[PDB]
Amino acid sequence: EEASSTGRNFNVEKINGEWHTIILASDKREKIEDNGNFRLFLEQIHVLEKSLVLKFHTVRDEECSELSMVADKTEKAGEYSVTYDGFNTFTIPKTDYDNFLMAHLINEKDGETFQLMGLYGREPDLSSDIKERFAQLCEEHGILRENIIDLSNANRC
């Protein structure tokens, strides 16, 4: 079965655990390019009662750095917020819990905004079919494929 965090049948506990960043996308491409603050490699999601603890690592000069963040539930069901290089809110428009999770995030910094979409997998990669479904979801949000970066060959330390 598949679900959206904003949907009636969402079971947040089912997204707990191991995850890997497979693809990142953004309408401000520089944010997820090599030196971007949003080129974040997810490692795990710890589901708590009113929040999600997100464990990531960033890479620089081929060196990994750990980063942890706490995302709080907002008043919108299925939406979480987190302070990181500005103010962020995000939802999970589609996940099947066992293979993939697709997130859509809005960042606001210095009076500006941009969209970020991420495709995470339980394993370090996903099938080409799931990657295509992600490209379609990015398209629905006005993000061109040229702004979608597959990081499956660079998500391990």
Please state, in angstroms and as integers, the Cα–Cα distance from residue 78 to each residue in 9, 29, 91, 131, following that order.
11, 26, 6, 23
Q: Does 24 bind ligand OCCCCCCCCO (CB under 6 A)?
A: yes
CA–CA gap between residue 114 and residue 36 (Å, rounded): 13
Q: Does 103 bind ligand OCCCCCCCCO (CB under 6 A)?
A: yes
Q: Does 148 bind ligand OCCCCCCCCO (CB under 6 A)?
A: no
- Say how many residues touch ligand OCCCCCCCCO, by CB under 6 A: 9
Q: Does 78 bind ligand OCCCCCCCCO (CB under 6 A)?
A: no
Q: Does 135 bind ligand OCCCCCCCCO (CB under 6 A)?
A: no
- Find the shortest distance in angstroms from Cβ 55 to ligand OCCCCCCCCO: 11
User: Taking contact as CB under 6 A, which single stretch among the options 5-13, 38-46, 60-68, 133-141 is the one that binds ligand OCCCCCCCCO?
Assistant: 38-46
Q: Does 93 bind ligand OCCCCCCCCO (CB under 6 A)?
A: no
Among 25, 102, 116, 130, binds ligand OCCCCCCCCO (CB under 6 A): 116
CA–CA gap between residue 8 and residue 118 (Å, rounded): 22
Binding site for ligand OCCCCCCCCO (CB under 6 A): 24, 38, 40, 45, 90, 103, 105, 116, 118
